[PDB]
From a paper:
Coxsackievirus A10 (CVA10), belonging to the human type-A Enterovirus (HEV-A) subgroup, used to be associated mainly with herpangina, but in recent years has been increasingly reported to co-circulate with other members of the genus such as enterovirus 71 (EV71), CVA16 and CVA6 causing hand, foot, and mouth disease (HFMD) outbreaks in Asia, Europe, and North America2,3. Like most members of the picornavirus family, HEV-As comprise 60 copies of viral proteins VP1, VP2, VP3, and VP4 arranged in pseudo T = 3 symmetry, encasing a positive-sense single-stranded RNA genome. Intriguingly, although CVA10 shares ~69% amino-acid sequence identity with EV71 and CVA16, it utilizes a different receptor, KREMEN1, for entry into host cells, suggesting CVA10 might differ in its mode of entry into host cells or perhaps even in its local structural features that are involved in receptor recognition. Here, we provide models for CVA10 mature virus, empty- and A-particles at atomic resolution, and establish details of the events covering a staged exit of the VP1 N-terminus and ordered structural reorganizations of VP1 GH, VP2 A2B and VP3 GH loops and alterations of viral genome structure as well as genome–capsid interactions during the uncoating.
Compared to mature viruses, the CVA10 empty- and A-particles are markedly expanded with a ~5% increase in capsid radius. In empty particles, there are 60 extra small channels at the base of the canyon (off-axis channels), which are plugged by VP1 and VP2 in A-particle. As expected, both expanded particles lack visible VP4 and harbor neither an hydrophobic pocket nor pocket factor in VP1 due to the movements of the polypeptide backbone in residues 229–233 at the end of the GH loop and the start of strand H, and the conformational changes of the Met229 and Phe232 side chains. Interestingly, only parts of VP1 GH loop (residues 212–223) are flexible in A-particle. Unexpectedly, the A2B loop (residues 38–50) of VP2 located between the twofold axis and the base of the canyon refolds itself from an extended loop observed in the mature virus to a short helix in the A-particle, but is flexible in the empty particle. The most striking differences occur at the VP1 N-terminus (residues 1–71), which lies at the inner surface of the capsid in the mature virus, and is disordered in the empty particle, but traverses the capsid terminating on the external surface at residue 62 in the A-particle (the first 61 residues of VP1 might be disordered). In the empty particle, refolding of the VP1 GH loop and the VP3 GH loop and partial disorder of these two loops as well as the VP2 A2B loop result in the formation of off-axis channels. It is quite likely that the rearrangements of the VP3 GH and VP2 A2B loops, together with increased volume via particle expansion, facilitate the egress of the VP1 N-terminus, obstructing the off-axis channels in A-particle, which might be triggered by receptor-attachment.
Residue numbers in the entry:
A (entry chain A), B (entry chain A): 63 to 211, 224 to 297
C (entry chain B): 14 to 136, 143 to 250
D (entry chain C), E (entry chain C): 1 to 174, 183 to 235
F (entry chain C): 1 to 48
The structure:
Amino acid sequence: MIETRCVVNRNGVLETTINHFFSRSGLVGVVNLTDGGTDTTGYVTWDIDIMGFVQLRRKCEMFTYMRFNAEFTFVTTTKNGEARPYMLQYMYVPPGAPKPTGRDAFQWQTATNPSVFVKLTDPPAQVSVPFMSPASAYQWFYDGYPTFGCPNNMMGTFAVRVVSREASQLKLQTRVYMKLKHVRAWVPRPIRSQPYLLKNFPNYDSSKITNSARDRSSIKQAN
Amino acid sequence: MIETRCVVNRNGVLETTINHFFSRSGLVGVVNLTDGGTDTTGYVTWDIDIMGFVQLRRKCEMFTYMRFNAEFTFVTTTKNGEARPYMLQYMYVPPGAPKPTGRDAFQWQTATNPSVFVKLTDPPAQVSVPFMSPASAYQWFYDGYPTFGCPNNMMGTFAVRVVSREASQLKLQTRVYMKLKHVRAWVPRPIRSQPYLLKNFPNYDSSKITNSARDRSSIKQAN
Amino acid sequence: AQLTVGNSSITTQEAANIVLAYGEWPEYCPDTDATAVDKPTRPDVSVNRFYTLDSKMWQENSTGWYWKFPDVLNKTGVFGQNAQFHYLYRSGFCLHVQCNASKFHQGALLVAVIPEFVIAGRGEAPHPGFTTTFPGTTGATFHDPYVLDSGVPLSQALIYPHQWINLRTNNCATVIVPYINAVPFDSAINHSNFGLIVIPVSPLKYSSGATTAIPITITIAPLNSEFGGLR
Amino acid sequence: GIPAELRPGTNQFLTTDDDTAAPILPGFTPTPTIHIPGEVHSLLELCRVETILEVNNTTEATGLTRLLIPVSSQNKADELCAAFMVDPGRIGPWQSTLVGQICRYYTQWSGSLKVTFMFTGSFMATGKMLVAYSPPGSAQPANRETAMLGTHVIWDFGLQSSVSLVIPWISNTHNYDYYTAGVVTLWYQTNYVVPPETPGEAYIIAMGADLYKFTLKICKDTDEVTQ
Amino acid sequence: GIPAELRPGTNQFLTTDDDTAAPILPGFTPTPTIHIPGEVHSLLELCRVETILEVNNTTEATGLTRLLIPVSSQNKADELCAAFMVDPGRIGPWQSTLVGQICRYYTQWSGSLKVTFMFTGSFMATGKMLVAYSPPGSAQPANRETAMLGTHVIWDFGLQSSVSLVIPWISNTHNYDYYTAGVVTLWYQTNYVVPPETPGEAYIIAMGADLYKFTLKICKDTDEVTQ
Amino acid sequence: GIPAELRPGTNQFLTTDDDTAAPILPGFTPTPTIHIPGEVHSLLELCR
């Protein structure tokens, strides 16, 4: 970097608020759609999960409880990336609803699953999902037995396909971007100092435990 | 699913209203347009009918009388689905008007049939159709002899063609989406427990009758 | 001072110094839809009183202990009876932790309350059994205190309602914990709301001839309990 | 003109979006409205109408006989007659009601219910029954004594011909089965008593409904319709 | 219609842009909010909670023993015990605090800090320590005399069991290392004094926190998480 | 929605045009200003 001096003044206080700290839309997943006729499925489903990537996972595990609305954006391109006018369908499947079993399956025509049709040459589609939980908040720490299927606090699922009668040979990936909005948070936690072993559970390697601070020669010498 | 708990609070009352229960635009039909010169017709007509699919058919047969405005949306793609700039024409034919007899036939130029011209690379076209009946409501239960042609309560018909001098070899399907608006409903009915044999009539198989509840071992044991 | 609640009386000093968890007192629930139909039970006669566990023996080699609530009280007295059945449950607590030690003993204990405290697997996916989630009245001992067995630094445990017990200054600590949940009522049997933790940060030290083990006594007083329809 | 910037969401069709569509036939005035009786403003109006539970669902009953709860004079006092879950949204004998059918259009419900028993005997027949409700989380009662130790009604159908039992609260959140049920049972307090020359067999009819406290959320489509 | 002109920025997706997205599920009312205690409106609330510095970081300490500052009766008066930088955002023994972890999410910080020393001995042990702060731009003090010629505290842990030292101002602007540090040291004013039959060894615990004057800017992502 | 008509000048970038650009880093407050002596409001100050 550069610009080495002393800052005698207070900084702006607005950047440290919880609602600004969880803002800034970012990439929550990558899924891949090959429409190959019968040798390939021809659609994708993506369950809505915040913890899939550990960067934002670490920032939600700072708190016990959170409440928010989500805003999604789908950036979709084809292999090399050159785009052609193909219609697509992003269907949202509410919690407690059956997901598509196949490309032409009847679930795609269910009206209670809200959909959006947009051509692949158009600007990326945006969608706003409300607060979906039956409790007053989402909690990724629940001491007890939740069981019942996959991540905790099921928000829903998106499914994507191409809209055509005959399968168009086309290879797609849809990047999903999520921006949390109107975020409230309760009961803060300590930040995890250990590597994550697996999703949905806070497992850690017992044999190898990393220490929170790095090491120095002696305790009586700072530098 | 997931999230297993007890809900101690009243839910939102807004989702159970009649007007919200019949909202949510959905697929009312699929028709297919091949412009083949003289070996193929080269246009399509779709009569406006709600009962064509049994999902929404079952929800209109909950009531005796209904009143509403319709909003239609045409999602049209070509075979594999890649789109090219071809103009199309969706003509609406009011109740009591002659329908197109062919692709170039004079009915397409009648002005009292309102039309919309849109290229196949454009976003899908939307149209709002008012309440069309000579009575104060539509009724799909009429005890008596209606006769007179096809479904009851004729709303109209849509016809689609391609706008060109020479037939362009092109194979189209137009998905029609309908959203009911300002819905009023009267005199509620019981919900049908039997399979539908045919459209326009509430026939049921007399030999095989399905029972409204499934079966258990004994009456003295719940689980 | 002597605190007398029901048929139980404990000896303890009178000090206005306590720790309110997060700064709020236990409260009865704001009126809900379900309990407007059936008015919930708010017992205090023999139900809300001091319960005192079997005391724990802190020795030079120890790791430290935790408890899960409501669980620790699920088989006790007339609270565990009401804890059984009654598919709806709500309550706060008053927790007093004591240590009997001579002036010649040295050491310190970190004492904290963790909401939704989840012990994890030390492995694969070894889902921890009902022993770590529901240790019962006795409680459990930590394996790796440094990570709390949650994968989390014990250094940062101080954003939880907490009090130190330093055998130099104070031998006791008291934490008032309200009901903390994302829903007004919950099941006391299948869900533990929070947990209590006593970890020696500075180990116990004494010179030969002193008692080699120091007892830690727990006392639990429920506050503003509510119970639901009877299973 | 006025400078503008197109934005994500341009040129997309969202099916739930509320927006304006161009009128295709302007200057057309529809038929004026008149007053038709029986207008319905909510599905909750249709939940609150008590309809017949089919408690007899069995491979041995065919016609209207599945709507009838048998009560005879051969049975002995203290023993059970009928038992059924309270689950309007599950598969069982709530599937014949309207609550049962409407719940299939929603993912979550909650509120209170009402269950009515109606005795059709001869005028001169007499006896008592025990109408009891075991809340969720417990198996159905084993005998009459443990049914009597909980919410219940003693109904003498010589005096009173019909009895209602309000169920205080029920909920289904939602393939682990999240609804832990709770059961209504029927016991013989007495034996059904009959004078000379009158049948000695009667039937109970069961009905069920939602109280005004009942609500529904998260729309979906029914599992009954296949297509 | 209304004449308009599209403009640079049309049809682009900026990830930080605050704009409206179409509701995909209108007419849906979420679950009403209730009062959950311990709501957090700022990360600055989490900086001000004093948490344990790990001053003993060494290859020779493993467990909780890295959180302990050793003090024994073998050491002689006037000589140093422990020394550590004041740098919540650098690699060292601020990395176990919350200030340490939150600073990793921001490029610039500044404000004042607080460092608390807590003595756990026997009740009857006694002595003095010198808690001193050398500001940035100077090496740590060489002896006690030059530590005493600057900001410091004489802390007798026979009388007082815990002592706090406010650091007046610290800043990190920001791979030349722009932060010139400044150091806290611990000296033996006296020798640790012990009566008969009591251990003669104790431990100091160190804690650190931000005063209300502390602030942060220019968001980023932590170097700890790898993925 | 609201009916509109695109017009000549659509989708063009004029370099002197005064228009709004989207903030790429909102919620960021720059360093507060202080008083620095010798501020210049015109080139005519430098001609004289």
